[PDB]
Amino acid sequence: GSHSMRYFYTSVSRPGRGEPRFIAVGYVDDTQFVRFDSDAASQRMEPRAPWIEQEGPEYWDQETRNVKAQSQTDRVDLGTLRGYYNQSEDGSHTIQIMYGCDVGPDGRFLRGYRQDAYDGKDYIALNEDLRSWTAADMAAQITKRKWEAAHAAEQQRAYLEGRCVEWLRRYLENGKETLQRTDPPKTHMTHHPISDHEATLRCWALGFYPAEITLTWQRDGEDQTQDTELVETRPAGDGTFQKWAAVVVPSGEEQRYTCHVQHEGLPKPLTLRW
């Protein structure tokens, strides 16, 4: 029921050319739906989801114009930050920016985010209230003072609570079969004898959305974390996600070990055993 729209920008300076590499990616929920890559021939924001091709040419002109200007801002910013940090012109450096809005099940604005980084570390971020900035260091404190003078927080907040929610709602209505919906995990157990005396139980969750999920083991009613392994949740490539959790147990004693699966798409957490 809950949804989000996010944009991610990455600019990487090049000690050879000048024009940094700029890549912008838009998401609705976990679906990339638009991209711009300054390396590409088109020099346009391009569609990456079927349902966004329903947007008119007015749309693609406004979006291409915006991200190109952002890439130009990032290019100036790379120079400004090189100066703040007294860095040479010879190294490659990276600016990252992300922002976006979350809505609850009723479709109303729930929270907004905006955060910027330099060389893979926090630089400046909008606070949870959407009214003030957190600067990680003395250079970002200069940026914060500049942004306080130009009402940058107010502008970002107005977008996050307004146009961000408005267009997120529009895209959600554009998406139909292509827009991934809540999908409960399909579960199964595998069992691999290791030795004359141990075996691996692997609890699988497949085909689920959203990606948030909790797999836990219990031995005779109590949580078991020793002798367990858990892979990071991973995308299946089709809009759904996968995860597994494994436990090593005395062979033949598998009946004591239950996988518990918690997911928003389940009316009640699932339990399963070998």
């Binding site: 944009y7 749309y59 979006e63 952002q70 801002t73 400004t80 500049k146 502008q155 146009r163």
Partner: peptide
């Protein structure tokens, strides 16, 4: 739709 360009750092 995107936010307009961020304020220069």
């Amino acid at each position: 739709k995107t936010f307009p360009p961020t304020e220069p750092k």
